[PDB]
């Protein structure tokens, strides 16, 4: 595929780093013609199929295509692609917002009511990724960010998509790859990855989000693949006393060994905890509440 060969300073005035990768860099720009903000995101080529400083072409463009393609309001939209002898860079929407965890860290409470209010936020964006049959593989708290703090009612929006697949009928796909408290078994024991890995950082998402615990981290990075591939978790007490039945529900059927027996995206959606049937099941949710003390801590 055929990127903008033009110089991007050309088209834009870059400024300010917003973040970094191991490969990558992204800064804050105006384009010139409209005077609008975008993010830059620079990706550095490897140029050399021996070098290990780099990213793959193959994994650019994968990226790149999946980009194109998405058109939602709580996933991130690509804007233009540019190219140059060392670099690809990427014209994003400008996402300003910061991270979820860290603007719920700041509030004085959190009942479950106004937790799954941004909860649905970011189960419609998998809804709509999982409709076009895309699994993200990198769903956790630093790739859920807010379009703008400052708003009565915050966007959510999902970033990252450098381990998105598109899934293909006919070609099992195995790989070992993301962070290991997030990630499902199945990609700890190199088999086959679909759509309902996804489900399974959901389920630990929202452990974290009622809680401001990680349900499977261990003392070293063996100890919590092990945790993951026995679905080694607990509700404790300490962190668990003010959480409803139908939220533990919620969990315990997305954090599933068996990924065919795991609670999909559209099931998720019409789970009581989400969409009350009727009467005090409103109530659970709508009474109690996450332990701010505890969730604190963990976004420190
Ligand atoms: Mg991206
Ligand atoms: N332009
Ligand atoms: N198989
Ligand atoms: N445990």
């Known amino acids: 595929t055929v990127f903008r060969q033009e110089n991007v300073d050309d088209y834009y005035d870059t400024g300010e780093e917003l973040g970094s990768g191991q490969f990558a860099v992204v800064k804050k720009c105006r384009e010139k013609s409209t005077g ?24 650019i463009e994968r990226e790149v295509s999946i ?7 709580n996933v991130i939209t690509l804007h233009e692609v540019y190219e140059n002898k060392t670099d690809v860079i990427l014209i994003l929407e400008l996402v300003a917002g910061g991270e979820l965890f860290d603007f719920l860290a700041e509030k004085e409470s959190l009942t479950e009511e106004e937790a799954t209010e941004f909860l649905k936020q970011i189960l419609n964006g998998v809804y709509y990724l999982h409709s076009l049959q895309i ?8 790739n859920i960010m807010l379009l703008d703090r400052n708003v009565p009612k915050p966007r959510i929006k999902i970033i990252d998509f450098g381990l998105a697949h598109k899934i293909d009928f006919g070609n099992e796909f195995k790989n070992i790859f993301g962070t290991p408290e997030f990630v499902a078994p199945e990609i700890v024991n190199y088999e086959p990855l679909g759509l309902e890995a996804d489900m399974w950082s959901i389920g630990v998402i929202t452990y974290i989000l009622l809680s401001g615990a990680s349900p499977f981290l261990g003392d070293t990075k063996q100890e919590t693949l092990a945790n993951v591939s026995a679905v080694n978790y607990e509700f404790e007490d300490e962190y668990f ?14 954090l599933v060994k068996d ?18 049937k009727d009467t005090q099941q409103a109530l659970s949710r709508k009474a109690e509440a996450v332990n701010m003390e505890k969730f604190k801590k963990f976004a420190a």
């Open 259 to 276: 990924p065919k027996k795991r609670m999909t995206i559209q099931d998720s959606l019409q789970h009581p905890w989400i969409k009350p």
């Open 36 to 59: 609008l903000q975008y993010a830059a995101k620079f990706i550095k080529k490897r140029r050399t199929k021996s070098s290990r400083r780099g990213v793959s072409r193959e994994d």
């Open 67 to 73: 980009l194109k393609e998405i058109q939602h309001p």
């Open 135 to 142: 699994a993200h593989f990198d769903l956790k708290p630093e």
């Open 241 to 254: 006393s003010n959480t409803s039945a139908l939220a533990k529900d919620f969990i315990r059927r997305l």
